[PDB]
Amino acid sequence: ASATRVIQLLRNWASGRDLQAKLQLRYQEISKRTQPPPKLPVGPSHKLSNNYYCTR
Amino acid sequence: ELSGEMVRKCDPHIGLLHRGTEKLIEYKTYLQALPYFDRLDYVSMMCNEQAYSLAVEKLLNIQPPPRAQWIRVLFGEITRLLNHIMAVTTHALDIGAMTPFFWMFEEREKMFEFYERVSGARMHAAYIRPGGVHQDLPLGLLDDIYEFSKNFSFRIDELEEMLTNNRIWRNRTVDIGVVTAEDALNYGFSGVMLRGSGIQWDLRKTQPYDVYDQVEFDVPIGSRGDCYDRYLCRVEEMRQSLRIISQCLNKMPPGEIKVD
Amino acid sequence: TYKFVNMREPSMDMKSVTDRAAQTLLWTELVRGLGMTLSYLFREPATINYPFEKGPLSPRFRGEHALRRYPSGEERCIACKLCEAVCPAQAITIEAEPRADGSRRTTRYDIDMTKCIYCGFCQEACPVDAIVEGPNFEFSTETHEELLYNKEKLLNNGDKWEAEIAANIQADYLYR
Amino acid sequence: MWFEILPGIAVMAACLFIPGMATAHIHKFTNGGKEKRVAHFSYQWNLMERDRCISGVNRYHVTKGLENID
Amino acid sequence: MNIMLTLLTNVTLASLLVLIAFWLPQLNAYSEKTSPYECGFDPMGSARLPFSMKFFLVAITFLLFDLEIALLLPLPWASQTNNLKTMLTMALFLLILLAASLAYEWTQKGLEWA
Amino acid sequence: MFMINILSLIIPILLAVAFLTLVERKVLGYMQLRKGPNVVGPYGLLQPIADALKLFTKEPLRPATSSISMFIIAPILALSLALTMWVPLPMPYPLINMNLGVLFMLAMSSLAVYSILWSGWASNSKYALIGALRAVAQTISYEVTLAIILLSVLLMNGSYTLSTLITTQEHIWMIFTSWPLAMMWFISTLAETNRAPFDLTEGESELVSGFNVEYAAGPFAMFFMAEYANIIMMNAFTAILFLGASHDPHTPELYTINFVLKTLALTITFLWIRASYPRFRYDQLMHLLWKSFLPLTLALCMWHISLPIMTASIPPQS
Amino acid sequence: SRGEYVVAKLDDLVNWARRSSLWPMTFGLACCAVEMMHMAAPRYDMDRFGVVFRASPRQSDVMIVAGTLTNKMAPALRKVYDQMPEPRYVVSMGSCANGGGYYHYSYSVVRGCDRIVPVDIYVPGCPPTAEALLYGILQLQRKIKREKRLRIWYRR
Amino acid sequence: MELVQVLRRGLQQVSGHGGLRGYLRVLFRANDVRVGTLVGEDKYGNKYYEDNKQFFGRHRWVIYTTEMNGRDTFWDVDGSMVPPEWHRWLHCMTDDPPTTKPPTARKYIWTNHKFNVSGTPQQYVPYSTTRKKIQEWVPPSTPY
Numbered sequence A: 001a002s003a004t005r006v007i008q009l010l011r012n013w014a015s016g017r018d019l020q021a022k023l024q025l026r027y028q029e030i031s032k033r034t035q036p037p038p039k040l041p042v043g044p045s046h047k048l049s050n051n052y053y054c055t056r
Numbered sequence B: 001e002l003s004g005e006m007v008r009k010c011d012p013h014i015g016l017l018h019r020g021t022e023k024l025i026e027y028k029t030y031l032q033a034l035p036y037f038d039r040l041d042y043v044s045m046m047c048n049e050q051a052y053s054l055a056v057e058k059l060l061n062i063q064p065p066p067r068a069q070w071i072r073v074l075f076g077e078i079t080r081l082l083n084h085i086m087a088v089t090t091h092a093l094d095i096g097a098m099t100p101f102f103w104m105f106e107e108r109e110k111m112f113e114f115y116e117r118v119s120g121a122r123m124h125a126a127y128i129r130p131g132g133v134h135q136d137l138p139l140g141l142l143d144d145i146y147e148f149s150k151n152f153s154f155r156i157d158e159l160e161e162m163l164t165n166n167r168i169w170r171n172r173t174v175d176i177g178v179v180t181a182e183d184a185l186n187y188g189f190s191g192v193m194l195r196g197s198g199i200q201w202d203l204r205k206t207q208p209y210d211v212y213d214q215v216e217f218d219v220p221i222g223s224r225g226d227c228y229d230r231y232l233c234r235v236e237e238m239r240q241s242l243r244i245i246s247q248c249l250n251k252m253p254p255g256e257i258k259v260d
Numbered sequence C: 001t002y003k004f005v006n007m008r009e010p011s012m013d014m015k016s017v018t019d020r021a022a023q024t025l026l027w028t029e030l031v032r033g034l035g036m037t038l039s040y041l042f043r044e045p046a047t048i049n050y051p052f053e054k055g056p057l058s059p060r061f062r063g064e065h066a067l068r069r070y071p072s073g074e075e076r077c078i079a080c081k082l083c084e085a086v087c088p089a090q091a092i093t094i095e096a097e098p099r100a101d102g103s104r105r106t107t108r109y110d111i112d113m114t115k116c117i118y119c120g121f122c123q124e125a126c127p128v129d130a131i132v133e134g135p136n137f138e139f140s141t142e143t144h145e146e147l148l149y150n151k152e153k154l155l156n157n158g159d160k161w162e163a164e165i166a167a168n169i170q171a172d173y174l175y176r
Numbered sequence D: 001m002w003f004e005i006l007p008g009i010a011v012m013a014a015c016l017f018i019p020g021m022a023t024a025h026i027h028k029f030t031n032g033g034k035e036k037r038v039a040h041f042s043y044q045w046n047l048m049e050r051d052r053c054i055s056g057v058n059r060y061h062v063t064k065g066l067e068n069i070d
Numbered sequence E: 001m002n003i004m005l006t007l008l009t010n011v012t013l014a015s016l017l018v019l020i021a022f023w024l025p026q027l028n029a030y031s032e033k034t035s036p037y038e039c040g041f042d043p044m045g046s047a048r049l050p051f052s053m054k055f056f057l058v059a060i061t062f063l064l065f066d067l068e069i070a071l072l073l074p075l076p077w078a079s080q081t082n083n084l085k086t087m088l089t090m091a092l093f094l095l096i097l098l099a100a101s102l103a104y105e106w107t108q109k110g111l112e113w114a
Numbered sequence F: 001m002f003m004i005n006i007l008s009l010i011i012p013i014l015l016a017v018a019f020l021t022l023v024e025r026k027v028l029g030y031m032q033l034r035k036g037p038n039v040v041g042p043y044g045l046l047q048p049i050a051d052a053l054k055l056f057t058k059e060p061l062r063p064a065t066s067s068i069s070m071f072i073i074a075p076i077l078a079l080s081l082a083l084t085m086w087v088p089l090p091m092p093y094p095l096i097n098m099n100l101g102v103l104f105m106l107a108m109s110s111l112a113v114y115s116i117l118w119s120g121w122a123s124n125s126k127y128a129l130i131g132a133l134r135a136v137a138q139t140i141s142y143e144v145t146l147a148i149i150l151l152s153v154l155l156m157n158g159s160y161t162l163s164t165l166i167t168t169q170e171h172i173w174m175i176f177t178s179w180p181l182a183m184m185w186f187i188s189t190l191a192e193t194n195r196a197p198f199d200l201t202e203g204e205s206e207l208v209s210g211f212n213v214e215y216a217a218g219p220f221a222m223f224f225m226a227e228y229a230n231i232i233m234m235n236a237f238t239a240i241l242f243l244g245a246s247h248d249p250h251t252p253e254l255y256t257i258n259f260v261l262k263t264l265a266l267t268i269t270f271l272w273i274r275a276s277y278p279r280f281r282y283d284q285l286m287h288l289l290w291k292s293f294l295p296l297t298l299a300l301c302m303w304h305i306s307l308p309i310m311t312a313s314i315p316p317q318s
Numbered sequence G: 001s002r003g004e005y006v007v008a009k010l011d012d013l014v015n016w017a018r019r020s021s022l023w024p025m026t027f028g029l030a031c032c033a034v035e036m037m038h039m040a041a042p043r044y045d046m047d048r049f050g051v052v053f054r055a056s057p058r059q060s061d062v063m064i065v066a067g068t069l070t071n072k073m074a075p076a077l078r079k080v081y082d083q084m085p086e087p088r089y090v091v092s093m094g095s096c097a098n099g100g101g102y103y104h105y106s107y108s109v110v111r112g113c114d115r116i117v118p119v120d121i122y123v124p125g126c127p128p129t130a131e132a133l134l135y136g137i138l139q140l141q142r143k144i145k146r147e148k149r150l151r152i153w154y155r156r
Numbered sequence H: 001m002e003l004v005q006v007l008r009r010g011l012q013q014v015s016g017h018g019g020l021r022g023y024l025r026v027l028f029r030a031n032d033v034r035v036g037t038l039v040g041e042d043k044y045g046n047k048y049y050e051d052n053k054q055f056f057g058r059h060r061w062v063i064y065t066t067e068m069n070g071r072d073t074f075w076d077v078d079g080s081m082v083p084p085e086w087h088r089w090l091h092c093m094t095d096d097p098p099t100t101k102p103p104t105a106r107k108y109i110w111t112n113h114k115f116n117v118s119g120t121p122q123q124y125v126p127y128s129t130t131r132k133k134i135q136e137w138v139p140p141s142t143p144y
């Protein structure tokens, strides 16, 4: 956060905890908004043999 | 009926929001009736989807894939955080404590985009469907859920700092609405309304569904049956949800998200 | 497997009793909550400067509907009517005739946004990616009649948001 | 951030500082550049009335010193 | 007379604000708008019906407590006397009697409501 | 020139109330991770003007069941008394110098209560009647403790003259001498102005809008202005009584500034309390004020009567 | 003329005050009320624009119908609207309040609040996002900005 | 101390917007005076800025044009004035501005984005798009 050391110390004392560690606002730890393309797997019935529907 | 401000008789008149959901469901297919459950409890949406999905799957005699069940529980507990935030903050808001409402609703906003990033809707995701879920988790969603749940514990502790030990909050809740264990069962109470009176009963423990028998969590139990004890149960349930969420974020299995 | 909230007796040591009396008389927990909210005072507010700043959204966002066209420029809608059949709110009204070329083209494609539940079932049922809930969510109108979209409204919407709709499809179609 | 509240606090500070200053300046203006004399007791009021007559102009603020005698 | 001037100015300013409030805006009144507010539904009974006080005893005793506060007000001037022993004894006597009345009301469950 | 002084004590107070509305909104927002009014004017400085213009251009409604005379008299009494309770305040020089300004303040507050009473009664609504009865119960609970604490803290002043408070605190704040009385007086002032943890007369979350539920446009604006003016005036009273300020007779501005800053700090603490605690139940309010303060106020009254005699420190009469 | 200029400037002053200090009443019926709470949430902060949620209808300027308007609720909604002192505005939020939404063909749902009260802004969605509702309210502020109430009076 | 740094940042914000006049202009139009890297400007005149030092939700913002499609938008800035290609980047649907990754060019895609035209003469009026179903019988024009 863009908070000065005096303000950070006052905030931590008033709260009683280290707020600068577990900040609620998200800055950079979020995942990227442009993720690589995926490749999802097929299910257990995507086989060319021994897969008659009467058995499942 | 008030004698001064003492409540002689309390008569709830309901039906002002009766939209005939049960009748409208009869005219629509099982898939078309799924969005109706999102609107039943519009504070806990995906939990309603799961209950309807389980009922249909039980009749269908099918089984959702292992990965879908974990997604149903991961978002089942994120849904629980959404409701308990609404349940506690608005309860405190009506008492007079307005500040914790805004603190937690920012976290409630962060969980809303978890709904939106996985379904495309902030509240009514219609994501949990009979047979699993609709789509697989987008890449990078699990990491962002971890980042949220990492710091969400402090938010609950900040909430407790303002309410748990406040003598004004205790005066408004301690020994208010005391429900005996026997009366709660007879009157049909369930959930926190039972465990707030000491009754040890949780449907995730006694009658587990999906993968709730593979996660570890503690059931908070009240001791006096008043509003304050049920307040502590809901606050502790939020903490226990984070315990479940962490397990779901580490035990997520590979596989498909729909019954094949 | 279960936990006891409350159910904690207090120690009756003279030091502990004195500490409790000091808490009662000097309002220690009240000052504690005051310090908590004072700390919240000096935090950075989470407000975003709307409409100059817009909240985060995802490619799967379900917003204003739009009828897409093939790269060739022709409508993808081939009037299969299953988007109308799956719509749980019965918001879609479709009428079709054999066009002058003989193709399956709708003559009426009407969706009342005032009845739609923004479920997406329509875009998920369409076999040619014609009807697609686009990314637009700020299309509020001053009159009820403007929300009863025609085929012309949807086609126009699709042509306006195509660039973005396409990009979102390309980003998300692997999950579908 | 939090310093954005300061403009309103400063405007309210000016609005609350006006009354006091205005009263002090009006008291000095209407009492010959001196604090407005208090008359909590009848003795002080009698002193004020005598001073008014001594002044000769029916105003108590103007005070006549040793120059007036003889 | 200055206090009278201040009171007159304040009252006139307030009444002028009332006048401007009731004559500047565009008024459109009808029966439904001016009906009593009961959270959207029509009230059952009249608002001028009896409203039981569960703290009536507290008020009747607050009468006598206000009396005692009136008796205690001259104390700052009473300390300027030469008979400080008698003055102090009488002041403590009045305070002790006030405390005793409060204690009697408290123990006999008078401060409790209903 | 006296009329100019009256105007210079009324108009700035109304402007201070108007901007205190904005200050409260922004403080609550920034303590709730929000931003107060920030669009209307720079940093929201034009919000109070917009609110006032909206309210006074809004149609006022006269309830059909309401007694018109009282319904109109109540708002006037509320504002007139709220503006009058500033007349005797020493900043550093009081507009009207009374030998018993303190009792004048007490009487003026006691009368202001009838504004809420009559507004509630005349509104002829169940919620308004409940609000009026809650105001009655509130004034039953705090008045005795308020007067006793004020008497006890003025026992070191020598008189009820407000100006003398500056002299008594020439070397030390009187809060260092009566801080338990200071705490109880602060809570009593919170209860009196129908303010934080004691907002029972209005009860937004329990009585919709309390006594002023049937008030709209101008009269509602007058009640709000009266409420906030009473807030600032009571905080000013708390400042002069306990947080004394240096007064150089040749530079009164020094006191004025110190005084204003202390009053602003106390108002900010009022808002701070408003956004930090839940609301009392007025049964619990009366029980607190009658069973935890009142015994302690009586004990401290005994103590502050006996102390100057036992320490030979009786303050001068004049 | 000088007369029109003064009236036009006065009309702008009146419009600016009303549109920048809109006070919606705390009136939420269904799912859409939850998203309405998120507009008052810190992220969007409706109070930042001067939009403050008053409780009593007599101290409100806008009624945001957020949720399904059932038949049992319709008389209550109308009376609460009628008790709002003019100028009052109605903003319909969600498809349930627009034309009945998911429950359009229901025996106990009014097909839109338009059949009960006149609506100024229709906010589409089920539920509309907190920005969509904020967009509608900001659109209402623009609509009030285009109100020539005094300017027409000078030309009546 | 760092208060000097904070005041220096304030003066740098004053200078960055092009003097005090620009600082006031951005203050009374967007209620925000912080500066950011200029990602790009669309043809309609909107300017898009970015500052990754801000928390997620304020790291991207747009300053709307003062004139769009023949409408004075100096004060009446609208949320629908963002063209679709910048709508992804502004709403954080992607991390790629359209300047870097251009949208795919189609002939049917509008060459002029239009804001919400509700309440204007260009608003959308619904109507039936099908032809008349039953054709009436035209009586003969010749007498008998």
Ligand code: SF4
Pocket: C076, C077, C078, C079, C080, C081, C082, C083, C084, C094, C125, C126, C127, C128, C129, C130, C131
């Ligand atoms: S939009 Fe798609 S699903 Fe609907 S009728 Fe056309 S082709 Fe079929």
Ligand code: SF4
Pocket: C083, C086, C087, C088, C089, C090, C091, C092, C111, C115, C116, C117, C118, C119, C120, C121, C122, C123, C133
């Ligand atoms: S989003 Fe759902 S309700 Fe709306 S048109 Fe599509 S299928 Fe029908």
Ligand code: SF4
Pocket: B039, B042, C117, G030, G031, G032, G033, G066, G067, G068, G093, G094, G095, G096, G097, G101, G102, G125, G126, G127, G128
């Ligand atoms: S429009 Fe949708 S979300 Fe809103 S109240 Fe109706 S059903 Fe619920």
